[PDB]
Amino acid sequence: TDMSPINPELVQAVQHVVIGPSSLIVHFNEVIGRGHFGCVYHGTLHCAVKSLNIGEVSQFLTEGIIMKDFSHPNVLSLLGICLPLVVLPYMKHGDLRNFIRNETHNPTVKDLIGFGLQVAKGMKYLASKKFVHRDLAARNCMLDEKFTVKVADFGLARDMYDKEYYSVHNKTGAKLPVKWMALESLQTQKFTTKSDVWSFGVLLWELMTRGAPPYPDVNTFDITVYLLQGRRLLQPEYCPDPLYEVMLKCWHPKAEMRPSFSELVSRISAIFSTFIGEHYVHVNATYVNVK
Numbered sequence: 001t002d003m004s005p006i007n008p009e010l011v012q013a014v015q016h017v018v019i020g021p022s023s024l025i026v027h028f029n030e031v032i033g034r035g036h037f038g039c040v041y042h043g044t045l046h047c048a049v050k051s052l053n054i055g056e057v058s059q060f061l062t063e064g065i066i067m068k069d070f071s072h073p074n075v076l077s078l079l080g081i082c083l084p085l086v087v088l089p090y091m092k093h094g095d096l097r098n099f100i101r102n103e104t105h106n107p108t109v110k111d112l113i114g115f116g117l118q119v120a121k122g123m124k125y126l127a128s129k130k131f132v133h134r135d136l137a138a139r140n141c142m143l144d145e146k147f148t149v150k151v152a153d154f155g156l157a158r159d160m161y162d163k164e165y166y167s168v169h170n171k172t173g174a175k176l177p178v179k180w181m182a183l184e185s186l187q188t189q190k191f192t193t194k195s196d197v198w199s200f201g202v203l204l205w206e207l208m209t210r211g212a213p214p215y216p217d218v219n220t221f222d223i224t225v226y227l228l229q230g231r232r233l234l235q236p237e238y239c240p241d242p243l244y245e246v247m248l249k250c251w252h253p254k255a256e257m258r259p260s261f262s263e264l265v266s267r268i269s270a271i272f273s274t275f276i277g278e279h280y281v282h283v284n285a286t287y288v289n290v291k
């Protein structure tokens with residue numbers, strides 16, 4: 001790549017994931033959200049129920065067991081499955097991007113770095129389980145009633161929850177979040193933990209801009225050409241210098257040189273500790289109403 005610029009066994013194993021049909025009520029009237037692979041609904045077990053569409057039933061059950069094993073306060077857990085329903089905890093404040101964009105919320109610099117810090121702790125956990133997210137972005141993290149950020153949009157909850165930010169590769173037909181993708185993944189369509197780190201860098205930029213779209217009007221795989229002119233996202237007005245240095249390390253041309261999620265947790269927690277909640281972050285006028 002260019003990096004310099006120019007089945008009885010399965011049935012008993014899945015028993016701890018299955019929810020009984022009579023112990024779950026799905027409210028099909030109240031559409032929480034929509035996705036390509038399944039619509040999400042209000043449920044009572046209080047929860048969110050995503051309803052999906054023989055060979056593929058193995059895959060559904062097996063994905064449930066792997067996903068049920070993930071337990072961490074900054075990771076969206078799986079409450080269970082039902083049969084094609086995916087039962088998830090209800091997140092009161094919805095997705096992180098919409099939350100920070102909302103003009104009636106008044107986040108401080110400390111608040112937003114805090115969300116970033118929480119996301120890093122979630123990825124640190126997922127990365128320790130050898131799990132590559134492939135689509136880390138503020139739209140795909142969620143926020144509960146205590147403002148705990150949970151990395152979401154993985155396993156059976158995987159979808160395109162805002163079609164706007166996914167672009168079709170002309171050959172393969174795969175719709176990909178090109179504005180969040182590492183320089184190497186744009187060229188190969190292979191994803192690693194180090195390509196998640198790049199995405200996390202972009203997520204930090206989203207946090208400090210209160211959910212501005214990255215790279216306005218650079219929307220296709222021609223982002224690769226843009227990056228290879230020698231470019232990175234600009235430092236946001238309310239982003240501290242040390243945090244922007246962290247963002248630039250996340251976008252290191254050589255994947256191996258990017259920091260681990262352990263190192264990111266360490267560095268961000270230090271930066272975070274210096275703030276006391278006196279810097280209100282306001283939205284840039286040039287990013288308002290921009291997609």
Ligand SMILES: Cn1cc(-c2ccc3nnn(Cc4ccc5nc(NC(=O)C6CC6)cn5n4)c3c2)cn1
Pocket residue numbers: 032033034040048050076088089090091092093094095139140141142152153154157161162
């Ligand atoms: C823009 N966008 C992002 C998503 C999204 C992203 C990642 C996901 N990972 N799983 N899911 C299903 C799910 C799980 C719990 C949940 N809680 C709510 N609560 C609300 O919508 C509150 C505000 C009224 C909705 N969900 N949706 C996800 C949905 C949906 N749209």
Ligand SMILES: [Cl-]
Pocket residue numbers: 108109110111275276277278279280
């Ligand atoms: Cl602050």
